[PDB]
Structure 1
Amino acid sequence: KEAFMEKLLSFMKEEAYKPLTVQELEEMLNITEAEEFKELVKALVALEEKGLIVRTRSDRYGIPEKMNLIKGKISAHAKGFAFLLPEDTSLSDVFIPPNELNTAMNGDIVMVRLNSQSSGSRQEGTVIRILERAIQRVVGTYTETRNFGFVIPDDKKITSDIFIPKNGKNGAAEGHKVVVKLTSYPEGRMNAEGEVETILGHKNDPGIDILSVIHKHGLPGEFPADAMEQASSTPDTIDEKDLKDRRDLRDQVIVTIDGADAKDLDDAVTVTKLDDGSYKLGVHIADVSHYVTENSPIDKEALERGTSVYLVDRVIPMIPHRLSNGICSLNPKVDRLTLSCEMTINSQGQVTEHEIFQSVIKTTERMTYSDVNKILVDDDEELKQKYEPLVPMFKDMERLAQILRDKRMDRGAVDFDFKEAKVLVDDEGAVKDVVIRERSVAEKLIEEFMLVANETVAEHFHWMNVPFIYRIHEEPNAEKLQKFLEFVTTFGYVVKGTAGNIHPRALQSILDAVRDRPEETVISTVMLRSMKQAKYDPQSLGHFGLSTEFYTHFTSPIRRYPDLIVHRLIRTYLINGKVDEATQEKWAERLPDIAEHTSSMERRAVDAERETDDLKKAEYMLDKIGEEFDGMISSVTNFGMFVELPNTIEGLVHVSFMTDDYYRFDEQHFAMIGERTGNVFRIGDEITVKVVDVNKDERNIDFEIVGM
């Protein structure tokens, strides 16, 4: 027993050791008999009792003493406590009490000592050392006192007011939103001090709510002067020299299909039906890489931005509005340079032949998604008569998209078809209406045409075996997916598979089963919360969500920097023929940094976008205080339950407002159960709620239960 314990401890004391589960230790030690497995379990218990190893709350055994600790990122809470997120994502979160934070702020990389006694269900710890500081700038509202100011942070995870000394005011008045640079951190009983770096405006001025968010997330402001000079210097028409070595496609029937308000038209499409019954799809993408050359002023800015950001009232573009809307845009009935992906596609949706080449197009018409729907779905005779020459292509497009879809779904892609909000605002940025974003036939057609192209490009460059950027989606978290599999068995949905080896189709089968059920929205939602996020990578590690081995982003270089790179690599490798070792080594060095950065800038964009949506949703609901709505329970917690309305507005029912009974949370079923009444509110029950309180600043909506 002791010799086995020593051998296990010595193995765990190797420098290459990472914390492992019981099953991972079984495999790594090559334990095959059931009796040796018992010995391992008794040894792990005995060593954990002695304190020589620690089981994390994700059931992974690590040597504390090499730590007695865990390195990780702080995730603070607005009530003064935090959680450690360990660097090893396979490990569980460690709770940190407010008194044990030891001056650590939200996002800070820390080292946390594990407490030998937990007072609750999760593992507790103390911050012993802050390795890196995350927060240097803080947005907030300035407030003036006699001798000093203070700024109340917009991030409520910063629970303490930032002292501003009288010299660090720099012009800020009472109620001004300000950007504060931290000069000192909190220490003992002293709050953080800082100087006002920028004044945004008064908090009551139109659009300083949105401008605060832009500043909180550190989103890019105005373009640099040299970028603005480069953009201004770029021609508004094509030079005849640039038509050299480009396939002339100006006489073909080519069309863009976008939103009515879209000015940045990245993509144009054509579909010809061949005599054999196969389809020829031409996807033609804006040649941004021509105009924005490598290491140009606009290029350096486009890398720093990483993506365009689409906030409620405005778009922050990745490249200046002169290029994006002007020469790079595939504007109607003018000559435009394009990097084209042309594809012969059979009756099974299989790309038999393809070609990637530079071209010049002249778009026959700029269509919208509403017009194309009216033609195909609504059978509108006025619009058909208006666009009579294009109607035959639109019907062959629809069929082709349907074929591709069928192939994509068959292959086992996960159609995650959820209802998204679209906040409508006026010119002043006051909220008019929150409406459901509906994905029509016209969007789902284009989608399919952007997908197959993206898949085509990625496959080509995989087989070329040159340094390239992919858009990957790794397999889901086995712990997160395991819990999801438990959750769906409560509703009766049984899944074939284990969490470690799930094929996308098996997930699709569920989403098919729940379709047009009350439990749809949430199982959907909880499935999502089991998935990993998709990221850019130099390696082709496949795309779980699309159930494909090869995927990239090619089809939107105006608004995404990884698409602009794909174009430059296309130009480099295919067009110029520069497949030399030095060219490869250059790109192999730079793509990892690009892929990590751009992936960060995407996540940043999404977080900000959402943060403005939640703010404007809260602004919409201010006048609805007292009004009753029907909604569905989207999430249940120990403190209350979330209810989503029909327009995807979500608000909390706090357990305090549940005055009819003492409600106990059940975590296994996802339900609050009354002790006395025996009323059970579960995830996915429809209920009628009334609006009690809405805090716009906090972005909170509070609901009370009227009836079930």
Structure 2
Amino acid sequence: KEAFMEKLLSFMKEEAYKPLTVQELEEMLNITEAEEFKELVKALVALEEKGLIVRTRSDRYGIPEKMNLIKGKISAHAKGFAFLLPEDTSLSDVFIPPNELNTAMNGDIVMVRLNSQSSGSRQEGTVIRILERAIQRVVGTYTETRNFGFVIPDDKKITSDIFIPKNGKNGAAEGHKVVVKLTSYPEGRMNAEGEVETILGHKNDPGIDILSVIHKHGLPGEFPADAMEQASSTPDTIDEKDLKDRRDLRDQVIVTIDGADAKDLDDAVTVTKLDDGSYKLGVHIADVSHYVTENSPIDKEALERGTSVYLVDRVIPMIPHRLSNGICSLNPKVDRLTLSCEMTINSQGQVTEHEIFQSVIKTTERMTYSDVNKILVDDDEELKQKYEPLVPMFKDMERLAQILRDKRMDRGAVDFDFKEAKVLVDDEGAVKDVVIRERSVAEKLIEEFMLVANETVAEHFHWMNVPFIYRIHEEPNAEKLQKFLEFVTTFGYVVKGTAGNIHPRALQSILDAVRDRPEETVISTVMLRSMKQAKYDPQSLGHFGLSTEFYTHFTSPIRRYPDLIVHRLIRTYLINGKVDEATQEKWAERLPDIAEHTSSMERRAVDAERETDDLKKAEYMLDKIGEEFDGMISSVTNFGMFVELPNTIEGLVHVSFMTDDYYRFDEQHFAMIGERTGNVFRIGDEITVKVVDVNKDERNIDFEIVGM
């Protein structure tokens, strides 16, 4: 028994050892007999009792001592506790009590000692060391006292007020939202101290709410002077020299189909039906790599920006408004430089042939999604008569897009069709309405055309075997998916597969079965929560969500830096023919940092857009205090249950408002069960709620139950 325990501990003490499960230890030790398997489990329990190994709450055994610890990121909570998110995503989260944070703030990379005993369901730990400080600046509301100021942070995860000394005020008055720079971190009993870097304005002034979010996240402000000089010097028309070595497509019937308010027209499309029955699809994308050249002032800024950010009241663009909306934009009935992908597609949606090349186009008409739907779906005779030459092309586009959609779903792609909000604001930035964003035929048509363009480019460059950027979506976390599978089994939905080896078509085989059910929204939602996020990467690792091996972003260079690089690598490798070793090694070095950076800037963006939506959703419900709404239980917890209205506004029913009974949370069933009444409020249940309170600053909406 002891010789085996030593041999396990020595194996785990090897420098190449990573934390492994019982099964991954069984495989690595080549244990095939059932009696040796019993020995291993008995050794693991005995070593874990002695404290020589630690099981993480993802059931992975690691030598603590090489750590006694886990390296990871702090994810703080507004109630003063936190979790460690380990770097190894296979490991579970470690709970950190408020007293054991030891001055670690939200986002800080820390080393956490593991507590041999736990007071709850999860593994506890103490922050022993802070390796990296995440928070240097803090946005908050300044408050004035007699002799000093303090700033109340907008990030509620910062649970302590920032002390502003009398010299660090820098003109900030009572109620001003302010950007503080942290001069000292919290230490012992002392709060953080800081100096007011920037006054944003008063908290009640219009647009300061969104301007506090921009600064919180650290989103990019005004363009640099050299970038705006480059933009102002860029020609408003094409030079005749730039038409050289480009295919002339100005005589073809080419259209843009966008939102009515869209000015940054990235894509233009055509479809011709061939005599054999196959479709030729042209996709013509704005040639931004021409205007924005490598290491230009705009190039350095766009990389820094990483993506365009689309907040409620404004867009922060990646490139200046003179280019994005002017010369890059595929504006109607004017000559525009493009980088095209031209595709012959057969009757099963297979790209038999393709070509990628530089062209010039002149768009026949700028269409809207609304107009294209009214022609196809609503059968509008007035608009058909208006666009009589284009209607036959639109009908061929509809059929082709359906073809491509069928193949996509047959290959086992996951159609995640959720209701998103669109917040509608006025000129002052005050909320008028919160509507559901509906995806029409016209949006699903262009989607399919950008997708088949995006796979086609990605496949082309994979086989060329040159350095390139892909848009990958890795396989879901097996533990998160294992929980999701357990969740849907309560509703009856049994899935064919295991959490380690699920096929994308298996998850769709859920989303179809729940379609037009009450439990749709939440199973949909919890499925998402088990998926990984998509990122950019120089390796073609495939896209799980689209069920494809080859995918990149090619179709939006105005508003995405990874697309603008895809444009450059197209110009470098195909057009210029520069496939030399020195060119490849140059890109092979750069693409990892770019791919990591732009992926960070995307996540930052998405977080910021959401925060502004949740703020304006809360603003919208201020005047609805006392009104009753139908809704659907979107989440249940130990403290209460969240209720989603039809417009996708969410709120909390706190358990204190559930006055009719003592309610116990059932974690397995995701249900609040009354002890006496036997009333059961489950995930997915339709209830009628009333608005009790609304906090705009916190973004909180507080309901009470009227009826089931």
Summarize deviations over 1:2-31 as a string: whole Å, max 9, x none.
Answer: 111111111111111111111111111121
Q: Give the secondary-structure state (helix, strand or coil) at the position aligned to 1:513.
A: coil
Distance across 2 between alignment mates of 1:29 and 1:378: 66
What displacement does 1:171 show?
1.1
Distance across 1 between alignment mates of 2:18 and 2:679: 46
Distance across 2 between alignment mates of 1:435 and 1:569: 40
What displacement does 1:460 show?
0.1
Taking the TM superposition and a 5 Å limit, the aligned residue runs for 1:360-509 are: 360-509=360-509
**Corresponding residue of 1:5:** 5
What displacement does 1:35 show?
1.5
What displacement does 1:174 show?
0.9
Distance across 1 between alignment mates of 2:174 and 2:439: 45
Distance across 2 between alignment mates of 1:87 and 1:379: 55
Distance across 1 between alignment mates of 2:26 and 2:683: 37
Distance across 1 between alignment mates of 2:666 and 2:144: 47
CA RMSD of aligned residues (A): 0.6
Higher mean displacement: 43-52 or 28-37? 28-37
Percent identity for Structure 1 against Structure 2? 100
Distance across 2 between alignment mates of 1:252 and 1:559: 26
Distance across 1 between alignment mates of 2:117 and 2:686: 41
Higher mean displacement: 657-666 or 455-464? 657-666
**Corresponding residue of 2:276:** 276
Summarize deviations over 1:265-291 as a string: whole Å, max 9, x none.
Answer: 000000000000000000000000000
Taking the TM superposition and a 5 Å limit, the aligned residue runs for 1:256-271 are: 256-271=256-271
Distance across 2 between alignment mates of 1:347 and 1:117: 63
What displacement does 1:295 show?
0.1
Distance across 2 between alignment mates of 1:408 and 1:650: 32
What displacement does 1:259 show?
0.2
**Corresponding residue of 2:647:** 647
What displacement does 1:625 show?
0.5
What displacement does 1:611 show?
0.2
Summarize deviations over 1:603-649 as a string: whole Å, max 9, x none.
Answer: 00000000000000000000001111000001111111111000000
What displacement does 1:38 show?
1.1
Distance across 2 between alignment mates of 1:190 and 1:363: 64
Summarize deviations over 1:392-432 as a string: whole Å, max 9, x none.
Answer: 00000000000000000000000000000000000000000
Q: Give the secondary-structure state (helix, strand or coil) at the position aligned to 1:237.
A: coil
**Corresponding residue of 1:216:** 216
Taking the TM superposition and a 5 Å limit, the aligned residue runs for 1:471-620 are: 471-620=471-620
Distance across 2 between alignment mates of 1:627 and 1:336: 52
Distance across 1 between alignment mates of 2:583 and 2:26: 46
Distance across 1 between alignment mates of 2:678 and 2:31: 48
Structure 1 unaligned spans of 5+? none
Distance across 1 between alignment mates of 2:434 and 2:37: 57
Distance across 1 between alignment mates of 2:30 and 2:328: 59
**Corresponding residue of 2:322:** 322
Q: Give the secondary-structure state (helix, strand or coil) at the position aligned to 2:512.
A: helix
What displacement does 1:669 show?
1.0
Summarize deviations over 1:174-231 as a string: whole Å, max 9, x none.
Answer: 1111100000001111110011111111101000000000000000000000000000
Distance across 1 between alignment mates of 2:519 and 2:222: 45
Q: Hey, which bits of structure 1, 4+ residues long, moved more than 4 A?
A: none
Higher mean displacement: 165-174 or 289-298? 165-174
**Corresponding residue of 1:311:** 311
Distance across 2 between alignment mates of 1:192 and 1:341: 55
What displacement does 1:170 show?
1.0
Q: Give the secondary-structure state (helix, strand or coil) at the position aligned to 2:66.
A: helix
Distance across 2 between alignment mates of 1:30 and 1:601: 44
**TM-score computed with the length of structure 1 as normaliser:** 1.00
Summarize deviations over 1:646-670 as a string: whole Å, max 9, x none.
Answer: 0000000111111111111111111
Distance across 2 between alignment mates of 1:626 and 1:30: 66
Distance across 2 between alignment mates of 1:407 and 1:117: 53
What displacement does 1:150 show?
0.7
What displacement does 1:391 show?
0.1
What displacement does 1:55 show?
0.9
Distance across 1 between alignment mates of 2:128 and 2:541: 38
Distance across 1 between alignment mates of 2:27 and 2:497: 20
Q: Give the secondary-structure state (helix, strand or coil) at the position aligned to 1:428.
A: coil
Q: Give the secondary-structure state (helix, strand or coil) at the position aligned to 1:606.
A: helix
What displacement does 1:363 show?
0.2
Distance across 2 between alignment mates of 1:3 and 1:415: 54
Distance across 1 between alignment mates of 2:373 and 2:425: 25
Summarize deviations over 1:654-699 as a string: whole Å, max 9, x none.
Answer: 1111111111111111111111111111100100001011100000
Summarize deviations over 1:81-108 as a string: whole Å, max 9, x none.
Answer: 1111111111111111111111111111
Q: Give the secondary-structure state (helix, strand or coil) at the position aligned to 1:269.
A: strand
What displacement does 1:261 show?
0.2
Distance across 1 between alignment mates of 2:119 and 2:183: 36
Summarize deviations over 1:358-405 as a string: whole Å, max 9, x none.
Answer: 000000000000000000000000000000000000000000000000
What displacement does 1:131 show?
1.1
Taking the TM superposition and a 5 Å limit, the aligned residue runs for 1:79-158 are: 79-158=79-158
What displacement does 1:125 show?
1.1
Distance across 1 between alignment mates of 2:542 and 2:433: 39
Summarize deviations over 1:429-478 as a string: whole Å, max 9, x none.
Answer: 00000000000000000000000000000000000000000000000000
Distance across 2 between alignment mates of 1:698 and 1:667: 27
Structure 2 unaligned spans of 5+? none
Summarize deviations over 1:101-131 as a string: whole Å, max 9, x none.
Answer: 1111111111111112211111111111111
What displacement does 1:341 show?
0.2
Distance across 2 between alignment mates of 1:546 and 1:192: 46
What displacement does 1:70 show?
1.2
Summarize deviations over 1:56-76 as a string: whole Å, max 9, x none.
Answer: 111111111111111111111
Summarize deviations over 1:251-270 as a string: whole Å, max 9, x none.
Answer: 00000000000000000000
What displacement does 1:164 show?
0.7
**Corresponding residue of 1:28:** 28
Q: Give the secondary-structure state (helix, strand or coil) at the position aligned to 1:703.
A: strand
Q: Give the secondary-structure state (helix, strand or coil) at the position aligned to 1:65.
A: coil
Distance across 2 between alignment mates of 1:186 and 1:48: 35
Distance across 2 between alignment mates of 1:2 and 1:112: 30
Q: Give the secondary-structure state (helix, strand or coil) at the position aligned to 2:140.
A: strand
Q: Give the secondary-structure state (helix, strand or coil) at the position aligned to 1:652.
A: strand
What displacement does 1:37 show?
1.1
Distance across 2 between alignment mates of 1:483 and 1:572: 46
What displacement does 1:494 show?
0.5
Q: Give the secondary-structure state (helix, strand or coil) at the position aligned to 1:461.
A: helix
Distance across 2 between alignment mates of 1:129 and 1:603: 27
Distance across 1 between alignment mates of 2:569 and 2:281: 23
What displacement does 1:33 show?
1.7
Distance across 2 between alignment mates of 1:483 and 1:618: 31
Summarize deviations over 1:297-319 as a string: whole Å, max 9, x none.
Answer: 00000000000000000000000
Q: Give the secondary-structure state (helix, strand or coil) at the position aligned to 2:341.
A: strand
Distance across 2 between alignment mates of 1:483 and 1:82: 22
Distance across 2 between alignment mates of 1:677 and 1:91: 41
Q: Give the secondary-structure state (helix, strand or coil) at the position aligned to 1:360.
A: strand
Distance across 1 between alignment mates of 2:307 and 2:248: 30
Distance across 2 between alignment mates of 1:30 and 1:625: 65
What displacement does 1:524 show?
0.5
Distance across 1 between alignment mates of 2:621 and 2:24: 50
